[PDB]
Amino acid sequence: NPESADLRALAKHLYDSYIKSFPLTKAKARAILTGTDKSPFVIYDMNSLMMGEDEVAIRIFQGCQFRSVEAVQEITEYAKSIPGFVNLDLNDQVTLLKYGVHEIIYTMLASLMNKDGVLISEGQGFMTREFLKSLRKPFGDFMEPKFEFAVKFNALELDDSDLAIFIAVIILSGDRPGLLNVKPIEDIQDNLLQALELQLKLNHPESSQLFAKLLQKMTDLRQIVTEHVQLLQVIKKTETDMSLHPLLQEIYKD
Numbered sequence: 001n002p003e004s005a006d007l008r009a010l011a012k013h014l015y016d017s018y019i020k021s022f023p024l025t026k027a028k029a030r031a032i033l034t035g036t037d038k039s040p041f042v043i044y045d046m047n048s049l050m051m052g053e054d055e056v057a058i059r060i061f062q063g064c065q066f067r068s069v070e071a072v073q074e075i076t077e078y079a080k081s082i083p084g085f086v087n088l089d090l091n092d093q094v095t096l097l098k099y100g101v102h103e104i105i106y107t108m109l110a111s112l113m114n115k116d117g118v119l120i121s122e123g124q125g126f127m128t129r130e131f132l133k134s135l136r137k138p139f140g141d142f143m144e145p146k147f148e149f150a151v152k153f154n155a156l157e158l159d160d161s162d163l164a165i166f167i168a169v170i171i172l173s174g175d176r177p178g179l180l181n182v183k184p185i186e187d188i189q190d191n192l193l194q195a196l197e198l199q200l201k202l203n204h205p206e207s208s209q210l211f212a213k214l215l216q217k218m219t220d221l222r223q224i225v226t227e228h229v230q231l232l233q234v235i236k237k238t239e240t241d242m243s244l245h246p247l248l249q250e251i252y253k254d
């Protein structure tokens with residue numbers, strides 16, 4: 001159909017920009033995770049941690065802070081590629097990014113996780129879930145919620161071409177707080193949803209209602225972010241000497 005043909009073109013466009021914006025794709029993440037030249041060093045305790053280089057919790061926490069900032073930067077680049085996005089009111093572009101980056105980060109982070117750990121430093125390392133959970137309070141509780149989501153989300157078996165359209169849908173949510181013009185945004189998201197639906201139908205013909213199942217996952221993301229910000233309030237009070245990146249603080253004033 002000429003219609004479904006316009007949707008495929010959009011899917012292809014989004015997939016292309018996705019690959020150009022995110023250096024560590026799920027395809028590569030899985031290749032590293034499921035096993036010669038791509039094998040990561042494994043951090044499961046203190047000595048391995050110290051060897052990986054070749055206050056512990058705080059060192060890991062800021063490292064993870066730095067990457068988030070980087071990720072925010074990659075997501076922002078990707079956003080501009082979404083047709084119509086740059087033509088929207090500037091204030092809304094900022095609002096959409098403010099509320100969307102973390103939901104996207106956790107979505108893409110699932111790509112670098114399995115039930116036992118996380119790929120780090122661009123796949124060169126793998127930090128054990130057990131280790132991350134042994135960290136001093138309240139740091140020991142920072143990643144568990146993300147792993148729980150990933151195990152379930154990863155069960156959907158989505159590939160990069162699917163995720164590309166899905167994160168585009170996440171960014172263009174007309175229900176974000178403070179949006180000036182909701183109409184232009186919904187018209188775009190509507191078009192993206194149409195593209196995602198077709199993509200899922202064609203790429204996963206035997207996966208019944210994957211589309212609805214993926215959309216319901218948007219519920220789980222919102223929870224983990226809300227849960228995350230609460231943990232940051234604790235850190236600010238117990239670690240008055242620990243520094244927090246400005247860009248991240250500007251996004252959390254919600």
Ligand SMILES: *[C@@H](/C=C\C/C=C\CCCCC)CC(=O)CCCCC(=O)O
Nearest residue numbers: 063064065067068109119120121122248
């Ligand atoms: C961050 C933990 C690890 C980051 C993933 C890989 C590390 C690769 C760098 C080499 C060391 C977990 C989070 O993403 C927490 C939420 C983001 C932080 C925030 O925005 O507050």
